[PDB]
């Protein structure tokens, strides 16, 4: 006459796979992903102000090409430039075009 | 025991509308021991048996919809569906499971609000087959009208009946969310062929008038 | 809608410390690195029996 | 693949004794309690208990101690729940449900399809199926009547009409008899060109019927 | 585990201990039951919840940057930024998958040493009422009922209320 | 700690042990008294310092580097510059971070074993004769004056010459 | 190590045992021998072939690079290239140490682990058949032959079978 006492943990029926140390894979009850690896597929207008370029490069807003002008002295914290973008006006390079387009956008 | 009880008993709620039930045990059901609440929730379509949304008061069941949670604590819970869809007609059940007995609550039906549809109604004379058989059937139809509440009334030469009929009513139909009954009255052959006039009177919120519908043996 | 991290692919979230969805970004950022998933453990050892 | 495959349907007599049995697989039987629910027609679940299933201990729900003894065998990764002196109140549908812990603290995740026992001094008996024979629409139908046990299937023209069917849940009479009956909207205009046929199964008699309804 | 109780003594976990992570069962003279351990699994999960708070604390913020893609090829200086770049992505790659490993080898290692602190526990308070059956299982040689199981685990257990009998029965 | 000891089955430290990390405290028939155990001491100690001295060992040694400050906006090549400087320093200050997180569970972990191993030292040198209270204590089941606890403390009790005493008053 | 068995209460290794990493030594009335204990070797040695084999995985392949030396003097760009590659080299540099020195720690603590578990399972086992010495070494208080250190050795020591006799020899 007397009585047994056990001590013991808990268990799933399948838990989840992480790396340690010592082993490439082991089962533990629960692990959290650290990595994210997906998005919406789209820019949020908040907190930050977006100007979405579209047919205008940054470049072409400064210099004032016509069809751009509506982008006059307007502001951004990120200027989205756009893939269908395009010149219109006179055909022109710039030395350095990188680094205007960056010190500008800056 | 521990008693649950849950509230309303039946809840009405419009597609992609939000619907909200509740629950009270009799007794807490929170553990300061273990800081969870010893609570789930469970939805129960006809004919098959219950399926855990919720448990510890507020964890959902894997592969549930996130459209699901609930919370509360103690004896105050609450099962929210925050838009409702088609298959989420069905019933709903609280169960506590911090002490032996196990106890449900009653259970709340949920079904699709609709705008008010009337009842259509047919009657049926008993066939002469049956009638062979010493007995009759006849048969009150009331198809697809909403809600669900609808008063059947059998005339037998105008002295009204009770006692001597039986209702049954469809589960809300998945296509248009109305409902449908049969009643049927019964007598032997002998009273049967005694009176004329068998009639069966509709009382529903879709039908202005009450609709009798009726034939003469 | 609001986001404070954002890629040219679109938003991120930035609860996690990683990200591999690009390595531009613009705002508070998850730092971006080659794996695609990285478990951190947050129970024991599983241990299922029979 | 968590599983719990319950006992068929069983039909007995007022102080009678039933047992049925519930077979578990997927998971490691002796880690998880056993429970028995059952739920009367139309009404809410009632716990009868449970058993402890790697020791075998139960207790029962007071209102069951009397005639209730729920079993395992562990070799057979099984549990058996047996009910003595039966009564019509007992009539209802008998689910084996795994604790989601033993020692019952714990919600249900995975409940058995049930197994309805249905308790009256009734006898097997077959269904007599008679017509319910015919604005713009009219309804026909059929009258399955003074049968025993449930349950009964119906179908219209063999499977192939089954838009504006309503087949009705069964009602039990003072005999004792459950009576059913089944309906559909069909177009006047049908009538007397479209044959209408419907189909009626009560496997506890062995009957399968199938009768034409006409004006 | 390091410490060899989760994984080692303790042969396996418990699937149906679903209100803890740590707990007791026991059989005595009025059946048997099960309850978990509080202050142990609280202890492990505080652990784990700091560490992760860390880890997930404070991602930096940047703003103006280097280009990444480019759409000519330039030489040296676009070598230069693609190499910064590739370069660095390699060794936060490498900080991240160091990172995870070192945790998890370490949220391992505090699980097993928080059963094992446990069971530590549980035998100090059993004093020589007990023995270690050697499976994370105490033998008990007094009677012992429900309220006597209890108060071992919550920690009131009066070792020399039972010990005439408990000696007595270990030893004679 | 993983050990349980420091901050576990020991209540709390002694604010009065000032010439030792770890030691003895005692009640006999000739009172009461304390020591430091100057082995595990010194173990913690060891272990500290030969870490702290891997830690403090040889910054490295840079020269000519690159410019760190501007005073005019020049574009590309200035952010280039900017952005190698800020991505070395995230990184080392990661390092640092990293560096003292790890060390400083280190040093936790292994203080809580030095007091583990202290007392699981003891208990074996006590064998039959005493009994673990709980609480980082020993109740020694046989008279033991202060020669005898100094016995202990300098690892050559004898527990053979206590061992029928000490049965007798157990059991 | 943090578990206080090797370099601890085990006074020293064994140069003689040459089959295994942790095992047996015993004496009884059949004489003195050795046995690897095969179960806890292993376990050290799957960690440790686990841990080196994560540490020599998947080496990085790179091609076109920058240049890294240089015989113009240049200024500007050549110092930024010049100090990028210096810097990678001391981050990586970093990492090497620091990656070998937590290793080399974790390797010296598992292993003192593995030979503390062993010890703790005999012990269980052994009941209160035996008394633990205090210098890896268990006194079995009963007569036990080779078959009965086999037993304890392949864990089929059965302790009720000797708790009488051994008892009697204790107490
Ligand atoms: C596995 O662990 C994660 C991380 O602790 C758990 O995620 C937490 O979930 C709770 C409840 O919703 C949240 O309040 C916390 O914010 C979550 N933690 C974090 C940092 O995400 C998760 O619940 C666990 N998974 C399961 C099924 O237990
Ligand atoms: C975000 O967008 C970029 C650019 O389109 C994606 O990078 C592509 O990845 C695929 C799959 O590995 C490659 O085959 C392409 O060559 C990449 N495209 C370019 C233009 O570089 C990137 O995969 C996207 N990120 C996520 C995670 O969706
Ligand atoms: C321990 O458990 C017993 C039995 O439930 C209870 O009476 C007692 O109050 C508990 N001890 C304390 C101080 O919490
Ligand atoms: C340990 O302490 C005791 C009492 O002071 C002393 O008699 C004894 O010589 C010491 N042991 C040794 C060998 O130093
Ligand atoms: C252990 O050794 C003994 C003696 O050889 C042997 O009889 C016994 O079967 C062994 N135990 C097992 C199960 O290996």
């Known amino acids: 006459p007397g009585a047994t006492l056990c001590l013991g943990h808990h268990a799933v029926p399948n838990g989840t796979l992480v790396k340690t140390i010592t082993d490439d894979q082991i089962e533990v009850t629960n692990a959290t992903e650290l990595v994210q690896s997906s998005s919406t597929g789209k820019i949020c207008n908040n907190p930050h102000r977006i100007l979405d370029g579209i047919d205008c490069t940054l470049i072409d807003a400064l210099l004032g090409d016509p069809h751009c002008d509506v982008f006059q002295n307007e502001t951004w914290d990120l200027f989205v430039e756009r893939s269908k973008a395009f010149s219109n006006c006179y055909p022109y390079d710039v030395p350095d075009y990188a680094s205007l387009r960056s010190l500008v956008a800056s | 025991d521990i008693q649950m009880t849950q509230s309303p008993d039946s809840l009405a709620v419009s597609l992609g509308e939000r619907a909200t039930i509740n629950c009270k045990s009799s007794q807490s059901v929170f553990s300061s021991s273990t800081n969870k609440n010893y609570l789930a929730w469970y939805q129960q379509k006809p004919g098959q048996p219950p399926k855990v949304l919720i448990y510890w008061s507020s964890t959902r069941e894997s592969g549930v919809p996130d459209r699901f949670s609930a919370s509360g604590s103690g004896t105050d819970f609450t099962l929210t569906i925050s838009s409702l869809q088609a298959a989420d007609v069905a019933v709903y059940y609280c169960h506590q499971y911090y002490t032996a007995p196990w106890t449900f609550g009653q259970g709340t039906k949920v079904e699709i609000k609709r705008t008010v549809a009337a009842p259509s109604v047919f009657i049926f004379p008993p066939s002469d087959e049956q009638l062979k058989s010493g007995t009759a059937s006849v048969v009150c139809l009331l198809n697809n009208f909403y809600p669900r509440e609808a008063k059947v009334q059998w005339k037998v030469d105008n002295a009204l009946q009770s006692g001597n009929s039986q209702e049954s009513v469809t589960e809300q139909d998945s296509k248009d969310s109305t409902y449908s009954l049969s009643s049927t009255l019964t007598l032997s052959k002998a009273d049967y062929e005694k009176h004329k006039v068998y009639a069966c009177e509709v009382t529903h919120q879709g039908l202005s008038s009450p609709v009798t519908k009726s034939f003469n043996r | 809608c609001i986001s404070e991290c954002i890629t040219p692919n679109g938003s991120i979230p930035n609860d996690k410390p990683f990200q591999n969805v690009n390595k531009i970004t613009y705002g508070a950022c998850p730092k971006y690195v080659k794996q695609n998933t990285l478990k951190l453990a947050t129970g024991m050892r599983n241990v299922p029996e029979k | 693949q968590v599983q719990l495959v319950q006992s068929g349907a069983e039909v007995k007599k007022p102080g009678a004794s039933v047992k049925l049995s519930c077979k578990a697989s997927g998971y490691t039987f002796t880690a998880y309690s056993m429970h028995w629910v059952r739920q009367a027609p139309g009404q809410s679940l009632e716990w009868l208990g449970w058993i402890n299933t790697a020791i075998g201990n139960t207790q029962y729900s007071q209102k069951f101690q009397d005639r209730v003894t729920i079993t395992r065998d562990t070799s057979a990764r099984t549990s058996y729940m047996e009910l003595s002196s039966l009564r019509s109140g007992d009539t209802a549908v008998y689910f084996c449900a795994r604790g989601a812990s033993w020692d019952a603290r714990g919600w249900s995740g995975y409940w058995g399809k049930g197994t309805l026992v249905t308790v009256s001094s009734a006898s097997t008996k077959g269904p007599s199926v008679f017509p319910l024979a015919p604005g713009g629409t009219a309804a026909l139908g059929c009258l399955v009547k003074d049968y025993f046990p449930e349950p009964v299937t119906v179908s219209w023209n063999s499977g192939a009409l089954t838009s504006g069917v309503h087949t009705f849940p069964a009602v039990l009479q003072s005999s004792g008899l459950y009576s059913l009956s089944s309906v559909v909207t069909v177009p006047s205009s049908s009538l007397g060109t479209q044959t209408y046929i419907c189909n009626v199964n009560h496997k506890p008699s062995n009957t399968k019927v199938d009768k034409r309804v006409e004006p | ?172």
């Open chain 5, 1 to 172: 585990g390091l410490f060899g109780a989760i994984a080692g003594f303790i042969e396996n976990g418990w699937e149906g201990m679903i209100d803890g992570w740590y707990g007791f069962r026991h059989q005595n003279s009025e059946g048997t039951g099960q309850a978990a351990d509080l202050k142990s699994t609280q202890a492990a999960i505080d652990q784990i919840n700091g560490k992760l708070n860390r880890v997930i604390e404070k991602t930096n913020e940047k703003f103006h940057q280097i280009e990444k893609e480019f759409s000519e090829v330039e030489g040296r200086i676009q070598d230069l930024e693609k190499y910064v770049e590739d370069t660095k992505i390699d060794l936060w790659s490498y900080n991240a998958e160091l990172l995870v490993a070192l945790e998890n080898q370490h949220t391992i290692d505090l699980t097993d040493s928080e059963m094992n602190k446990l069971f530590e526990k549980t035998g100090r308070q059993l004093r020589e009422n007990a023995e270690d059956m050697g499976n994370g299982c105490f033998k008990i040689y007094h009677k012992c009922d429900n309220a006597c199981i209890e108060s071992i685990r919550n920690g009131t257990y009066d070792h020399d209320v039972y010990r005439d009998e408990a000696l007595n029965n270990r030893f004679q």
